[PDB]
Design an enzyme around this catalytic site. Structure first.
Site, PDB file in Angstrom:
ATOM      1  N   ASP D  37     -47.835  19.244  10.229  1.00 20.01           N
ATOM      2  CA  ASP D  37     -47.958  19.889   8.935  1.00 20.01           C
ATOM      3  C   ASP D  37     -46.955  21.029   8.929  1.00 20.01           C
ATOM      4  O   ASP D  37     -46.575  21.536   9.992  1.00 20.01           O
ATOM      5  CB  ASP D  37     -49.384  20.402   8.690  1.00 20.01           C
ATOM      6  N   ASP D  63     -41.654  20.280   8.979  1.00 21.48           N
ATOM      7  CA  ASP D  63     -41.268  20.074   7.584  1.00 21.48           C
ATOM      8  C   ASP D  63     -40.686  18.668   7.491  1.00 21.48           C
ATOM      9  O   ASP D  63     -39.549  18.427   7.916  1.00 21.48           O
ATOM     10  CB  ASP D  63     -40.272  21.136   7.141  1.00 21.48           C
ATOM     11  N   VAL D  64     -41.469  17.734   6.932  1.00 22.27           N
ATOM     12  CA  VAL D  64     -41.068  16.325   6.912  1.00 22.27           C
ATOM     13  C   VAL D  64     -39.850  16.085   6.031  1.00 22.27           C
ATOM     14  O   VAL D  64     -39.219  15.028   6.140  1.00 22.27           O
ATOM     15  CB  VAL D  64     -42.217  15.399   6.459  1.00 22.27           C
ATOM     16  N   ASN D  90     -47.732  10.863   5.226  1.00 20.31           N
ATOM     17  CA  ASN D  90     -48.784  11.191   4.289  1.00 20.31           C
ATOM     18  C   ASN D  90     -48.558  12.494   3.537  1.00 20.31           C
ATOM     19  O   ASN D  90     -49.023  12.609   2.400  1.00 20.31           O
ATOM     20  CB  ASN D  90     -50.126  11.228   5.036  1.00 20.31           C
ATOM     21  N   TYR D 156     -43.478  13.567 -10.151  1.00 19.00           N
ATOM     22  CA  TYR D 156     -44.430  13.036  -9.183  1.00 19.00           C
ATOM     23  C   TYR D 156     -44.503  11.520  -9.277  1.00 19.00           C
ATOM     24  O   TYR D 156     -44.375  10.822  -8.262  1.00 19.00           O
ATOM     25  CB  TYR D 156     -45.804  13.660  -9.417  1.00 19.00           C
ATOM     26  N   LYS D 160     -43.525   8.684  -6.411  1.00 22.77           N
ATOM     27  CA  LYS D 160     -44.504   7.757  -5.858  1.00 22.77           C
ATOM     28  C   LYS D 160     -44.111   6.303  -6.099  1.00 22.77           C
ATOM     29  O   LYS D 160     -44.365   5.454  -5.240  1.00 22.77           O
ATOM     30  CB  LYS D 160     -45.894   8.065  -6.421  1.00 22.77           C
TER      31      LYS D 160
HETATM   32  N1  NAD Z   1     -55.675  14.091  -3.464  1.00 27.25           N
HETATM   33  C1  NAD Z   1     -55.370  13.238  -4.443  1.00 27.25           C
HETATM   34  O1  NAD Z   1     -55.984  13.221  -5.530  1.00 27.25           O
HETATM   35  C2  NAD Z   1     -54.164  12.356  -4.268  1.00 27.25           C
HETATM   36  C3  NAD Z   1     -54.109  11.189  -5.023  1.00 27.25           C
HETATM   37  C4  NAD Z   1     -53.139  10.239  -4.760  1.00 27.25           C
HETATM   38  C5  NAD Z   1     -52.219  10.472  -3.773  1.00 27.25           C
HETATM   39  N2  NAD Z   1     -52.272  11.616  -3.063  1.00 27.25           N
HETATM   40  C6  NAD Z   1     -51.264  11.853  -1.945  1.00 27.25           C
HETATM   41  O2  NAD Z   1     -51.962  11.948  -0.737  1.00 27.25           O
HETATM   42  C7  NAD Z   1     -51.148  12.671   0.212  1.00 27.25           C
HETATM   43  C8  NAD Z   1     -51.995  13.704   0.914  1.00 27.25           C
HETATM   44  O3  NAD Z   1     -52.273  14.783  -0.004  1.00 27.25           O
HETATM   45  P1  NAD Z   1     -53.724  15.425  -0.079  1.00 27.25           P
HETATM   46  O4  NAD Z   1     -54.396  14.900  -1.288  1.00 27.25           O
HETATM   47  O5  NAD Z   1     -54.381  15.282   1.241  1.00 27.25           O
HETATM   48  O6  NAD Z   1     -53.354  16.957  -0.340  1.00 27.25           O
HETATM   49  P2  NAD Z   1     -53.469  18.270   0.552  1.00 27.25           P
HETATM   50  O7  NAD Z   1     -52.852  19.415  -0.164  1.00 27.25           O
HETATM   51  O8  NAD Z   1     -54.951  18.525   0.818  1.00 27.25           O
HETATM   52  O9  NAD Z   1     -52.761  17.966   1.973  1.00 27.25           O
HETATM   53  C9  NAD Z   1     -51.356  17.664   2.056  1.00 27.25           C
HETATM   54  C10 NAD Z   1     -50.803  18.393   3.253  1.00 27.25           C
HETATM   55  O10 NAD Z   1     -49.377  18.170   3.343  1.00 27.25           O
HETATM   56  C11 NAD Z   1     -48.787  19.355   3.824  1.00 27.25           C
HETATM   57  N3  NAD Z   1     -47.368  19.355   3.486  1.00 27.25           N
HETATM   58  C12 NAD Z   1     -46.812  19.661   2.272  1.00 27.25           C
HETATM   59  N4  NAD Z   1     -45.501  19.726   2.284  1.00 27.25           N
HETATM   60  C13 NAD Z   1     -45.169  19.425   3.596  1.00 27.25           C
HETATM   61  C14 NAD Z   1     -43.931  19.320   4.265  1.00 27.25           C
HETATM   62  N5  NAD Z   1     -42.747  19.572   3.694  1.00 27.25           N
HETATM   63  N6  NAD Z   1     -43.951  18.975   5.570  1.00 27.25           N
HETATM   64  C15 NAD Z   1     -45.135  18.776   6.165  1.00 27.25           C
HETATM   65  N7  NAD Z   1     -46.362  18.860   5.645  1.00 27.25           N
HETATM   66  C16 NAD Z   1     -46.311  19.183   4.347  1.00 27.25           C
HETATM   67  C17 NAD Z   1     -49.582  20.475   3.165  1.00 27.25           C
HETATM   68  O11 NAD Z   1     -49.453  21.702   3.876  1.00 27.25           O
HETATM   69  C18 NAD Z   1     -51.009  19.917   3.243  1.00 27.25           C
HETATM   70  O12 NAD Z   1     -51.661  20.367   4.424  1.00 27.25           O
HETATM   71  C19 NAD Z   1     -49.948  13.216  -0.582  1.00 27.25           C
HETATM   72  O13 NAD Z   1     -48.816  12.372  -0.393  1.00 27.25           O
HETATM   73  C20 NAD Z   1     -50.421  13.123  -2.035  1.00 27.25           C
HETATM   74  O14 NAD Z   1     -49.305  12.998  -2.920  1.00 27.25           O
HETATM   75  C21 NAD Z   1     -53.217  12.547  -3.280  1.00 27.25           C
END
Ligand code: NAD
Ligand code: NAD
Ligand code: NAD
Ligand code: NAD
Ligand code: NAD
Ligand code: NAD
Lengths: 278, 278, 281, 279, 281, 279
Positions: D37, D63-64, D90, D156, D160
């Site tokens: 993360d 940082d991915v 992810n 976004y 995706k």
């Molecule tokens: N939660 C939803 O409703 C939802 C729905 C569909 C898809 N998604 C996708 O699911 C995935 C996970 O998101 P989530 O819902 O768990 O949100 P989240 O905010 O709870 O967790 C995502 C994590 O990614 C980390 N992150 C962000 N930028 C980063 C970077 N540059 N390098 C490394 N880590 C980084 C953040 O610090 C965070 O801890 C994402 O790709 C999001 O687009 C989420």
């Protein structure tokens, strides 16, 4: 029928071969003769010979590839005899060999004499004939090489196919124009004349600096054997040609035995079949 | 079959009509293109258009009637791509009218492009192709006017009959010589191209000072109607031509409906019958 | 219907292929042309020929991946003609090969042109068009590769699916904001252009030091063959695209034969089916 | 049957939401964990809790969007556990509003994480997995926004859809190359995570100086509301995802109710019909 | 057989027709040539062409009707080549029309050339040939008109019957005197030559002040037609004549088809029958 | 039947031989006579004897080789008797010897009388006869030497063959022109006349300065012998000639025995056989 007595014949290539034979035949029918050739010596000798046979004749040295000289020939004919009734666009030359081995000069030489000489004669004399309001006739000497495409003679072949087609078109144009001027197309097979020695009158400006290739030497030797072994003479060609003029027949095939080979080429075309070697 | 991918095509008359269509077809088969035309603007525009379609192409302004320029075209092709595999001797022009009303310049113009351009291309490129020891092919554009003699087009007709015969002879000469170089003869009927406006590229030195005659005006109007009303396009001619090259078929009749009229002319000859107007 | 004569078209990728054909079609309709490309030689020839045939046209060398240069293109458009009515976000590049064998530079290059170029175009020109209170329209060139996922083209596919969805979203956003600005999405199959030679305009900073792999070579040669053998030409794409603009139709599928394999992908998704293997080429 | 016990999982976005839930599920299955993360505090909370419960786990701040750091993540994974069998690309962020109102930095941010982060993971880890001659699997987190184009989420959505197609292509490429490396595509609807607060990890270089517009504020308010009110939790998504990995199932739709809206979009395309608003 | 190579031939009328052909044949056999004619232009051309092809030849303008000029021709022959072995008394002219309508000048002209020319030739050259003690031969050109009497040609007919009988008598006289000199009589039918244009060399002193009559015009045109349409040429006459000389044959009838009408005349005489009317022409 | 009584006969060579005998026969038939000879003394003896016996006769000294004098003979004939019905172009001379030994003057003399005298008579009198629209007849005296070629008489032979053919042609021409004017050809063998002494009337301008050669003397001796020994007389020839004129018979052969020799010559020609000496 076409009448000849007292009419005027202009004959190119008159110093030899078919042209000399046309002059002799014309003289025997009572024609006045205007003889043209680029070979000065042959022309002069032919004039003297015809005069010793009682013919009324003039000679005009003429390079038929030169439009101004063909115009000068017409002017000389009118000044001498007032009219032109028969024109034999007959002068011709040849060259042989694999097509791509021939020089640009070879192309220019053969097409200059065999096509442009005919073109100049038609262009210069047809208006004169159309203006006279009398029967007149133009005979163009092609060859069976204007109906066939034998190997290693492609430049000659092409020039003679051009003569065939322009003369066919002329036949239609004269009819569409109306009047008493007609034309015929003479397509002989090999006859013992001077045609295999045409190099004797190649102009200096068109000489080849390179020696003949193997295929050019072969083609030259082949043509000599073919020419020397023809069973009809130039006198026979003249007789048959004047018979055709009298009937205003367009196609003059002096050696109709060739027609089997002609049919073969025509069949190739109609069948879209790659050319047959017979 | 003849393979095209990565091979080099040299195309004359490439700025318009069949030549532009050959370039597009060749590009779609993966050919490298050397485009030649005397019309500078048309050539430049065709080069840009082909490049916008992803083709690898050069252009060389070339007057095919000029042997030195055709040699220069071959030199440019080799410098760019090292080889020549396909040659389209395709540039052509025309003129019409009663045969004797045409000028000496008309004869010189049409035969210079339609015959000497083809002759130069064969003379210059066939040795190059024979020396490569690879498959190669030469396509010469004649016309159904090389198989027929329609009225009031005698100069054009004669030039195209010359192309027919020289190309037939070439077919035999290439076989007698041996090797992997072949040739074909393209004989289309009327197609909507620029051919009726050939006067746009008549050289200054061959202009006519006299206004067109009644028959010349009639022939010009006739050709425009015939050209504009052709039911196959240049793209179709290109497709059919490349199919024929793949099969190394010699006679390419894009409009085989003409064969009834061709048979009529052939029958005239075989029967020694005065030419039929169909 | 949408009026073209006297209106202003901005076209990216105008030096070649679709962009050049858009410019030719726009000229024939009486449009004033602002043509943009990073290939200065091709762009200059396109502009020269159109102007010689009577077009009002300017050519502006533009790297559409660069936001400042896209802004400069709008400034040149407004300075020359005062308005922008039609925008073709059309420039694009590609790369192929097994997805994991491509470099970071490959991703940056393709996405910089194919996605960011479109993004800059929308961001810069949509406010201009909205402020004019006139009919205006934005056309984004995606591809059937934005509707399918053919093998060994994943970077290009991904960029084109991004263009598809961003343009679909723009369609709804423009309706929600209100006004007379609309948009369309162009999705062609293979057409003879320069697209298989895109490496010619890859910037030096994004070059690959490494040799191309087997799968990259195979993808390049397959793309070369498919592009050069397309049966519709760039002119046809331009004709169909302008017809769609005239009726403000959103989806422009110039090659509807693609629909069988688009339906196959859609039913994979709808059935939660593992992606159906593509047929042999 | 893809098996998990004793295998190594690399998980990005491990400090929160789906990534944390993948880590907890993997730990319960006996996996060795490499957690990444950009948020070091949240990453440490995840790592320390899992380690306290007896997992083999390391944390690597990553940082991915940065290819060098993704490579270092793979280097640390191999150094600690010798292999990589499961990769969850992810981590993700988002931004909203009328498409043309977004800044260039918004595009660069969202694509840097959502697309380039996935691209870097595939580029770095796929050759490792292919070279191991063992079963391995890559899971890319897209969204239902990779299957639909909802208004005011265009950046976004586009990111995706790019993930959707790159992963579909990866599926075909892996089969063309051969071997036992596969992949899946996770497409969830809204789930209560931290995703609505992604601005907390927007890097300084991509900050917006302008204040938000009306439509951006509207889109943020909508997302907060939608995320908060999802009926499935992150744990449920993790359960469903590992369930699908076990079967090597490619499309992972944790919320299949959206398929009516997906059929509508697909029908729009198939009919060349102007996009239908599902209202 | 009679030897030709290196021997001397004197030919009158050598500017045209038979005489020119005799000269050509003599040249081809290696004879030295003394060529005589009153047509200086025609004679000069004949000599020039033969010399250019390699002949030893001189040309001497000679009016054979003038005894002194025939003597001068022998003197020039002996001065150039020392010997005379072959003499062709061949020059001739003609006139036609109803016999009584012709003038005294017509008779004097035709008989002066056709009879007196032959007479001077024999008188001058026979003693020279007899004195040489060598094979020698004289050929006189008559005509089938020396064997027949066709209408409207009586002056010409009469002159040619004179040549026939004088040559027949010379045949017997040369045998009675003894020695190696012989002679032959050439009697051709119509051959294309200048003979129908003989008026071109009529001397001014023998011109007719009067206009030509109807029957004279008709005879002239009939002769023009018959001559120009002869199927054998002068070359053929020369070939047959030299073959006859080689075997020293007296009668040379190159056109034996004439024999039916010669027999008719002979049987008229033998039966004392009034001359049988000639068939229509 | 051609009738003679009261008609007018012009006779050349009237002082001797055949001409005198024609005159005597014509007088016995009641003809009016116009008699011509270059020998004025012999002409007067003929004229005066016939006039003494009651004939209508005039004499006109005439050199028939001179066209002017032949015209004057016709003028005198028309002046005296108004018409001319019968013309005997009969005067003749000869010379002998090897052909090449004769002089140019010998040729000019013999042809002047034998051919030109006949030609002048035809030229002058035929238009008169044709213009009269009455029966008239021209008789030309040739010889069997006009049908044969005996050696050493070549000039004479050639002159007589010329008379033969000109008279045959005259026969055809008169019929082509139409009318009642005809002609005949008299071809006698040797008869005792003065013909062997023709040198007595050779004109001065054509005299030979050289002495005769052996062959000329031989030919003269042969002729004297042959002429003296003919069995028919001039009177007989005149009888036969008027007999033939009455029938309009063309060929008058007073000595038909020569026809065997004539057939031989004709056979030579027909066979192209070198001339046979009849020995
Ligand atoms: N939660 C939803 O409703 C939802 C729905 C569909 C898809 N998604 C996708 O699911 C995935 C996970 O998101 P989530 O819902 O768990 O949100 P989240 O905010 O709870 O967790 C995502 C994590 O990614 C980390 N992150 C962000 N930028 C980063 C970077 N540059 N390098 C490394 N880590 C980084 C953040 O610090 C965070 O801890 C994402 O790709 C999001 O687009 C989420
Ligand atoms: N002889 C054959 O076997 C044969 C067969 C078919 C056709 N032909 C054609 O017959 C025609 C007559 O030729 P030929 O066979 O009598 O040959 P030839 O050589 O005997 O006579 C042709 C004559 O044309 C003259 N000539 C050449 N170039 C000329 C020029 N520029 N201007 C003027 N005169 C020129 C030559 O000097 C020569 O006298 C030619 O057109 C020839 O192609 C000949
Ligand atoms: N179009 C038809 O109906 C038709 C029918 C039968 C045959 N052809 C032949 O097809 C060929 C191609 O003509 P097209 O129909 O495409 O006509 P086109 O006018 O469209 O193209 C012919 C091209 O040849 C070029 N050209 C002319 N003279 C030239 C020269 N000296 N050097 C170089 N290029 C030159 C012209 O500039 C032009 O671009 C010609 O040989 C023509 O005779 C045409
Ligand atoms: N040709 C096809 O088969 C095909 C199919 C589907 C979609 N497309 C798309 O069509 C569009 C047009 O491409 P084309 O096929 O005409 O190819 P093309 O190569 O002929 O034209 C594309 C042009 O874009 C220019 N360009 C590239 N990068 C640029 C940059 N950074 N800034 C500005 N200009 C840049 C190139 O110089 C070129 O002139 C692209 O988006 C391509 O992905 C093409
Ligand atoms: N051509 C025929 O049909 C024909 C038939 C039978 C006999 N012939 C005879 O053949 C002979 C040759 O005549 P051709 O037919 O050759 O005719 P020709 O006119 O061609 O030749 C006769 C030549 O004799 C010349 N000549 C005339 N008068 C002369 C004179 N006084 N002195 C010198 N020369 C003189 C003329 O100038 C002319 O050149 C003549 O004796 C003629 O009668 C001719
Ligand atoms: N007597 C024979 O044996 C014999 C045989 C055959 C033919 N002929 C011919 O018969 C004809 C008559 O001769 P003849 O036998 O009575 O001989 P002749 O000597 O007895 O009489 C001929 C007469 O013609 C005259 N005469 C000669 N030249 C003359 C001239 N220039 N003009 C006018 N008169 C001239 C003489 O003076 C003489 O009186 C001649 O043509 C002769 O050639 C005679």
């Amino acid at each position: 029928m076409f009448e000849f007595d007292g009419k005027v014949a202009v004959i190119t290539g008159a110093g030899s071969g078919f042209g000399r034979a046309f002059a002799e035949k014309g003289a025997s029918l009572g024609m006045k003769l205007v003889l043209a050739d680029v070979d000065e010596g042959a022309l002069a000798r032919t004039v003297d010979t015809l005069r010793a046979a009682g013919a009324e004749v003039i000679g005009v040295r003429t390079d038929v590839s030169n439009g101004a000289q063909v115009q000068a020939l017409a002017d000389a004919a009118l000044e001498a005899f007032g009219k032109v009734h028969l024109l034999f666009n007959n002068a011709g030359v040849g060259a042989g060999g694999f097509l791509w081995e021939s020089s640009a000069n070879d192309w220019a030489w053969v097409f200059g004499v065999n096509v442009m000489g005919v073109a100049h004669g038609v262009r210069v004399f047809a208006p004169i004939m159309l203006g006279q309001n009398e029967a007149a006739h133009i005979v163009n000497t092609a060859s069976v090489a204007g109906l066939l495409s034998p190997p290693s003679m492609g430049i000659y072949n092409a020039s003679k196919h051009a003569v065939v087609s322009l003369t066919e078109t002329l036949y239609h144009d004269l009819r569409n124009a109306g009047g008493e001027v007609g034309c015929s197309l003479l397509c002989p097979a090999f006859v013992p004349t001077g045609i295999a020695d045409a190099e004797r009158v190649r102009p200096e400006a068109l000489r080849n600096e390179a020696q003949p290739t193997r295929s050019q030497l072969a083609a030259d030797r082949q043509l000599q054997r073919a020419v020397r072994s023809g069973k009809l003479g130039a006198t026979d060609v003249a007789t048959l040609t004047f018979e055709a003029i009298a009937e205003r027949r367009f196609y003059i095939l002096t050696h109709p035995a060739i027609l089997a080979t002609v049919r073969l080429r025509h069949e190739d075309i109609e069948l879209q079949r790659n050319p047959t070697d017979p």
